[PDB]
Design an enzyme around this catalytic site. Structure first.
Site, PDB file in Angstrom:
ATOM      1  CD  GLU A  15       4.112   1.355  -2.548  1.00  0.00           C
ATOM      2  OE1 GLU A  15       3.768   2.043  -1.554  1.00  0.00           O
ATOM      3  OE2 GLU A  15       5.314   1.095  -2.860  1.00  0.00           O
ATOM      4  CD1 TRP A  49      12.271   0.719  -4.817  1.00  0.00           C
ATOM      5  CD2 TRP A  49      14.102   1.477  -3.766  1.00  0.00           C
ATOM      6  NE1 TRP A  49      13.027  -0.369  -4.465  1.00  0.00           N
ATOM      7  CE2 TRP A  49      14.155   0.066  -3.817  1.00  0.00           C
ATOM      8  CE3 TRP A  49      15.156   2.174  -3.146  1.00  0.00           C
ATOM      9  CZ2 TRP A  49      15.240  -0.671  -3.281  1.00  0.00           C
ATOM     10  CZ3 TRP A  49      16.228   1.443  -2.610  1.00  0.00           C
ATOM     11  CH2 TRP A  49      16.268   0.033  -2.701  1.00  0.00           C
ATOM     12  CB  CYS A  65       7.598  -3.187   5.150  1.00  0.00           C
ATOM     13  SG  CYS A  65       8.787  -2.564   3.907  1.00  0.00           S
ATOM     14  NE  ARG A  68       9.106  -6.729   6.645  1.00  0.00           N
ATOM     15  CZ  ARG A  68       8.538  -7.657   7.392  1.00  0.00           C
ATOM     16  NH1 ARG A  68       8.989  -7.957   8.633  1.00  0.00           N
ATOM     17  NH2 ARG A  68       7.518  -8.320   6.862  1.00  0.00           N
TER      18      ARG A  68
HETATM   19  C1  HEM Z   1      13.029   0.393  -0.198  1.00  0.00           C
HETATM   20  C2  HEM Z   1      11.870   0.201  -0.864  1.00  0.00           C
HETATM   21  C3  HEM Z   1      10.567  -0.139  -0.129  1.00  0.00           C
HETATM   22  C4  HEM Z   1       9.517  -0.715  -0.714  1.00  0.00           C
HETATM   23  C5  HEM Z   1       9.414  -1.169  -2.200  1.00  0.00           C
HETATM   24  C6  HEM Z   1       8.487  -0.829   0.292  1.00  0.00           C
HETATM   25  C7  HEM Z   1       7.238  -1.381   0.086  1.00  0.00           C
HETATM   26  C8  HEM Z   1       6.148  -1.221   0.919  1.00  0.00           C
HETATM   27  C9  HEM Z   1       4.764  -1.433   0.604  1.00  0.00           C
HETATM   28  C10 HEM Z   1       4.198  -1.804  -0.774  1.00  0.00           C
HETATM   29  C11 HEM Z   1       4.060  -1.253   1.731  1.00  0.00           C
HETATM   30  C12 HEM Z   1       2.533  -1.376   1.923  1.00  0.00           C
HETATM   31  C13 HEM Z   1       1.883  -0.018   2.190  1.00  0.00           C
HETATM   32  C14 HEM Z   1       0.606   0.166   1.411  1.00  0.00           C
HETATM   33  O1  HEM Z   1       0.476  -0.407   0.300  1.00  0.00           O
HETATM   34  O2  HEM Z   1      -0.302   0.894   1.919  1.00  0.00           O
HETATM   35  C15 HEM Z   1       4.973  -0.940   2.807  1.00  0.00           C
HETATM   36  C16 HEM Z   1       4.625  -0.686   4.121  1.00  0.00           C
HETATM   37  C17 HEM Z   1       5.466  -0.237   5.125  1.00  0.00           C
HETATM   38  N1  HEM Z   1       6.840  -0.047   5.020  1.00  0.00           N
HETATM   39 FE1  HEM Z   1       7.947  -0.318   3.265  1.00  0.00          FE
HETATM   40  N2  HEM Z   1       8.966  -0.346   1.513  1.00  0.00           N
HETATM   41  C18 HEM Z   1      10.227   0.151   1.281  1.00  0.00           C
HETATM   42  C19 HEM Z   1      11.044   0.763   2.224  1.00  0.00           C
HETATM   43  C20 HEM Z   1      10.718   1.049   3.530  1.00  0.00           C
HETATM   44  C21 HEM Z   1      11.515   1.834   4.462  1.00  0.00           C
HETATM   45  C22 HEM Z   1      12.863   2.528   4.142  1.00  0.00           C
HETATM   46  C23 HEM Z   1      10.855   1.853   5.631  1.00  0.00           C
HETATM   47  C24 HEM Z   1      11.302   2.556   6.934  1.00  0.00           C
HETATM   48  C25 HEM Z   1      12.605   2.488   7.290  1.00  0.00           C
HETATM   49  C26 HEM Z   1       9.606   1.098   5.460  1.00  0.00           C
HETATM   50  C27 HEM Z   1       8.659   0.806   6.429  1.00  0.00           C
HETATM   51  C28 HEM Z   1       7.353   0.467   6.203  1.00  0.00           C
HETATM   52  C29 HEM Z   1       6.297   0.532   7.193  1.00  0.00           C
HETATM   53  C30 HEM Z   1       6.364   0.982   8.689  1.00  0.00           C
HETATM   54  C31 HEM Z   1       5.070   0.057   6.467  1.00  0.00           C
HETATM   55  C32 HEM Z   1       3.652   0.003   7.089  1.00  0.00           C
HETATM   56  C33 HEM Z   1       2.992   1.259   6.507  1.00  0.00           C
HETATM   57  C34 HEM Z   1       1.681   1.341   7.188  1.00  0.00           C
HETATM   58  O3  HEM Z   1       1.493   0.546   8.168  1.00  0.00           O
HETATM   59  O4  HEM Z   1       0.833   2.146   6.763  1.00  0.00           O
HETATM   60  N3  HEM Z   1       9.578   0.589   4.181  1.00  0.00           N
HETATM   61  N4  HEM Z   1       6.246  -0.986   2.283  1.00  0.00           N
HETATM   62  C1  LIG Z   2       9.084   3.919   2.657  1.00  0.00           C
HETATM   63  C2  LIG Z   2       7.982   3.371   1.781  1.00  0.00           C
HETATM   64  C3  LIG Z   2       8.254   2.920   0.484  1.00  0.00           C
HETATM   65  C4  LIG Z   2       7.181   2.410  -0.280  1.00  0.00           C
HETATM   66  N1  LIG Z   2       7.409   1.970  -1.535  1.00  0.00           N
HETATM   67  N2  LIG Z   2       5.914   2.359   0.212  1.00  0.00           N
HETATM   68  C5  LIG Z   2       5.632   2.798   1.470  1.00  0.00           C
HETATM   69  C6  LIG Z   2       4.200   2.733   2.009  1.00  0.00           C
HETATM   70  C7  LIG Z   2       3.347   3.960   1.662  1.00  0.00           C
HETATM   71  C8  LIG Z   2       3.408   4.355   0.188  1.00  0.00           C
HETATM   72  N3  LIG Z   2       2.144   3.972  -0.497  1.00  0.00           N
HETATM   73  C9  LIG Z   2       1.183   3.575   0.535  1.00  0.00           C
HETATM   74  C10 LIG Z   2       1.851   3.720   1.925  1.00  0.00           C
HETATM   75  O1  LIG Z   2       1.240   4.826   2.608  1.00  0.00           O
HETATM   76  C11 LIG Z   2       1.397   4.772   4.043  1.00  0.00           C
HETATM   77  C12 LIG Z   2       0.317   3.860   4.638  1.00  0.00           C
HETATM   78  N4  LIG Z   2      -1.000   4.451   4.785  1.00  0.00           N
HETATM   79  C13 LIG Z   2      -1.638   4.399   6.094  1.00  0.00           C
HETATM   80  C14 LIG Z   2      -2.125   3.000   6.459  1.00  0.00           C
HETATM   81  C15 LIG Z   2      -3.317   3.085   7.369  1.00  0.00           C
HETATM   82  C16 LIG Z   2      -3.310   2.441   8.607  1.00  0.00           C
HETATM   83  C17 LIG Z   2      -4.409   2.527   9.455  1.00  0.00           C
HETATM   84  C18 LIG Z   2      -5.515   3.264   9.037  1.00  0.00           C
HETATM   85  C19 LIG Z   2      -5.511   3.900   7.795  1.00  0.00           C
HETATM   86  F1  LIG Z   2      -6.582   4.603   7.381  1.00  0.00           F
HETATM   87  C20 LIG Z   2      -4.419   3.817   6.946  1.00  0.00           C
HETATM   88  C21 LIG Z   2       6.677   3.300   2.270  1.00  0.00           C
END
Ligand code: HEM
Ligand SMILES: Cc1cc(N)nc(C[C@H]2CNC[C@@H]2OCCNCCc2cccc(F)c2)c1
Ligand code: HEM
Ligand SMILES: Cc1cc(N)nc(C[C@H]2CNC[C@@H]2OCCNCCc2cccc(F)c2)c1
Ligand SMILES: C[C@H](O)[C@H](O)[C@H]1CNc2nc(N)[nH]c(=O)c2N1
Ligand SMILES: C[C@H](O)[C@H](O)[C@H]1CNc2nc(N)[nH]c(=O)c2N1
Ligand SMILES: [Zn+2]
Lengths: 411, 407
Positions: free
Chosen positions: A285, A280, A108, A111
């Site tokens: 994305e 947000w 993420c 953070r």
């Molecule tokens: C506040 C604005 C936030 C932004 C701009 C943001 C941004 C992102 C982005 C760009 C990713 C990569 C996912 C992808 O591209 O597939 C990500 C992953 C992730 N974020 Fe955030 N995030 C935000 C808030 C949060 C919040 C509130 C949480 C939970 C409390 C969170 C937890 C996670 C987790 C667990 C991942 C891993 C997703 C996955 O493994 O598929 N994020 N974040």
């Molecule tokens: C809370 C929050 C804010 C934000 N801006 N962005 C996010 C991530 C999600 C939104 N835009 C893409 C992400 O989607 C969730 C992640 N997708 C699964 C990852 C995964 C893992 C293993 C195997 C797979 F096939 C796929 C979360």
């Protein structure tokens, strides 16, 4: 043992000691790196040690480590585990746990914001209808008329693994995808299978390019049930371009609230299998991944045609050109409608500052470079140049198998 | 044991068995991934020699043959007596081709078996090194129809008689620290450029000054040499739509030739082994021109394009980045100097990975390096799971000689 990471653009070197607090495994060994692999019932036996480390962390963070209140809490949890096979988190511990799971989320980039997270405690919920109501409130609170606020809703923990609360949607708000007999897809190809289940469950599909999917909610291990989110609660943004007037005619829109609803939250050994959280969007994305992935809406060619680019050879960089324009459009459209969004330049700059802060105050920041680096313009963002260390801390968010694969249908 | 890699765009699944033949360490452990770190005797030599000869003889379908067993005994005895050994020409060529094949950070490996190997093991002086290098430059450049090549100088002995090219590449532009505090030319080479002046190079002090070669033979102090200008193919950078692009005063050289790496074959260490291929456009257009600590021309280009530079969210950097890279590819193609765009290079690499999985049982690949530095997810490598591991023969880094050499 101390580990150094260098930023090759600024020469700043940081020392990581926090990786020593790491329990879980990465997938890597001394002989193989699995850094680009997407995916590399608990007993009394295993439960008290997990509870203990978590409560030691919690009581250290409140500067009460070793206090009577610390000791009495350990004793009380230990007694509750022997008596009931599990335990209940206090509200203060649940809040700390959910915040730290985000703090520890190595993939993420958002953070910097970890400590401002609105936690909604939905552990008193018992039915899918109750779930639907908790989820509307979350979406309303988080949306806040375009001024987005981070939030998570936490439903009851896993017990025997037969009474699970699950949100079957991967995000609370997503668009339907429909496979046609001719092999083309209408709408979002990522959600084809989920859309099919919904329909099977009796959802009457409008069959358009952007149909907000219904909620499919499972309470207490029961078969899941369908709910329509009130449309007035779903903020959506029509996509136009500040200079290309034809862009609006593509018919594109996107929703404003990204809310992941398919992850498992682990706190002190307790497993919260339904814990939708939202923040947000970072523009890429939507603009890069949702619109331009070949397996998603796949609009590169159509946009490139309307730009009258030279599409006869890749080396014209027509894809790259259209890609930037689509992304300009997404950001312009969001900002004009006063819906919170962040571009990849500003988000990454913020992440580097957060990371430096974290090394200084916490002793480290686990980070997954493969995921942190944006999917366009990588090396013009400061994260491209930052060495990172990836390791697993708890509390944590984990993936879990899609519920239609595991669920026991009651009927 | 068996490991699977999935491509998430195509659903293609490949099974990796080749990793089981890995010997060197990754930097990672079960507890920590170091995937984004840039740098993560007679008894020692015989197992190494044996392991290499076994793979060589197996590659020519003669594993366990009389020729094989006999070669192993000959090497064993030479090691027993001299403390080292000498490669046959065939083994040297095989080892070089395979060090390239095994280079996990290289997207251009589809071409691995078409490498011209120049044996310079009979070289003894810096003047000889210069001759070999000029010949390599001219052969590889081929008037713009570039051909891959490596030139291999004598292997390490006691480690006090090292052959070294002090340049990081055979052809690079000078960087000078200026009274203003800024940098003229290439800031990556500020340190090397001062060493050249310290040895007596007369610097023209321009923005694109081709650096001299600084060559160390047999452990001796290194020596300056100017590459003949007519051997250095350069490309003036213009844009197919923007008339004004030409006047930014930009150019680049056609031949990328890495010269500071160490080639390890069968435990033998070749500390001077310059090798060259041809550019992917992004190396020049994204990294050389647009890295903040390199030529850093983004501000300037976006200025000529009259973009909105007030907010990062206008994506002015991204717009300019694209135009610059169109310019680099257009220029090279118009001049008939070989170049590949990131879309075609990454498409080939996916084809190569597929070849390697079915013919060799795998392909070590470092995702952090393979995915181009622009437009990552619109290239197919972005969506390709890769396994990174270290096979030998290999190319390895070595410290800069100036921090080590005894004068
Ligand atoms: C506040 C604005 C936030 C932004 C701009 C943001 C941004 C992102 C982005 C760009 C990713 C990569 C996912 C992808 O591209 O597939 C990500 C992953 C992730 N974020 Fe955030 N995030 C935000 C808030 C949060 C919040 C509130 C949480 C939970 C409390 C969170 C937890 C996670 C987790 C667990 C991942 C891993 C997703 C996955 O493994 O598929 N994020 N974040
Ligand atoms: C809370 C929050 C804010 C934000 N801006 N962005 C996010 C991530 C999600 C939104 N835009 C893409 C992400 O989607 C969730 C992640 N997708 C699964 C990852 C995964 C893992 C293993 C195997 C797979 F096939 C796929 C979360
Ligand atoms: C023929 C066309 C070739 C292309 C298009 C190509 C492409 C590339 C690229 C884009 C990189 C990434 C380095 C960076 O971005 O800084 C790289 C790295 C590398 N390549 Fe190639 N390559 C080619 C030929 C060669 C040859 C001939 C060799 C050796 C015989 C080679 C060996 C290596 C090695 C060892 C690395 C990693 C070096 C490092 O860590 O800096 N490549 N290649
Ligand atoms: C032979 C060839 C052809 C081609 N097109 N491209 C290449 C890569 C080189 C040129 N474009 C940049 C690369 O130069 C070599 C990479 N430099 C070392 C990276 C590194 C590692 C660890 C620590 C450091 F400080 C630096 C080679
Ligand atoms: C195979 C590869 O690891 C996979 O495509 C990853 C790469 N990096 C990513 N990074 C982000 N933020 N999101 C993703 O979905 C991916 N996909
Ligand atoms: C910090 C990180 O490891 C470093 O910036 C790497 C990332 N990926 C790279 N990829 C390539 N091809 N070349 C590079 O120099 C780098 N630099
Ligand atoms: Zn790793």
């Amino acid at each position: 043992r101390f580990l150094k990471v260098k930023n090759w653009e600024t020469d700043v070197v940081l020392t990581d000691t926090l990786h020593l607090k790491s329990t879980l495994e990465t997938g890597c060994t001394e002989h193989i790196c699995m850094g680009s692999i997407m995916l590399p019932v608990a007993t009394k036996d295993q439960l008290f040690p997990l509870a203990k480390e978590f409560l030691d962390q919690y009581y250290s963070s409140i500067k009460r480590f070793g206090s009577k209140a610390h000791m009495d809490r350990l004793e009380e949890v230990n007694k509750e585990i022997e008596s009931t096979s599990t335990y209940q988190l206090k509200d203060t511990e649940l809040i700390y746990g959910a915040k730290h799971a985000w703090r520890n989320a190595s993939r993420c980039v958002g953070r910097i914001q970890w400590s401002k997270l609105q936690v909604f405690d939905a552990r008193d919920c018992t039915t899918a209808h109750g779930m639907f109501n908790y989820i509307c409130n979350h979406v309303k609170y988080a949306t806040n008329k375009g001024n987005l606020r981070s939030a998570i809703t936490i439903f009851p923990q896993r017990t025997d693994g037969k009474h699970d609360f699950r949100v079957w949607n991967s995000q609370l708000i997503r668009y339907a995808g429909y496979k046609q007999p001719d092999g083309s897809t209408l709408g979002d190809p990522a959600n084809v299978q989920f859309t099919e289940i919904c329909i099977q469950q009796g959802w009457k599909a409008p069959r358009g390019r952007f149909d907000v999917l219904p909620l499919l909610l499972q309470a207490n291990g029961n078969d899941p049930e369908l709910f329509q989110i009130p449309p007035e609660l779903v903020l959506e943004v029509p996509i136009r371009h500040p200079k290309f007037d034809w862009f609006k005619d593509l018919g594109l829109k996107w929703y404003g609230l990204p809310a992941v609803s398919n992850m498992l939250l682990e706190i002190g050994g307790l497993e919260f299998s339904a814990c939708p959280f939202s923040g947000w969007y970072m523009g890429t994305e939507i603009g890069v991944r949702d619109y331009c992935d070949n397996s998603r809406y796949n609009i590169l060619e159509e946009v490139a045609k309307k730009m009258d680019l030279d599409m006869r050879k890749t080396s014209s960089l027509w894809k790259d050109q259209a890609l930037v324009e689509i992304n300009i459009a997404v950001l312009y459209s969001f900002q004009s409608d006063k819906v919170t969004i962040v571009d990849h330049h500003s988000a990454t700059e913020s992440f580097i500052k957060h990371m430096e802060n974290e090394y200084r105050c916490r002793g480290g920041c686990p980070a997954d470079w493969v995921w942190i680096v944006p999917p366009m313009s990588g090396s013009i963002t400061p994260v491209f140049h930052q060495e990172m260390l990836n390791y697993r801390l708890t509390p944590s968010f984990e993936y879990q198998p899609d519920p239609w694969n595991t669920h026991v249908w009651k009927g």
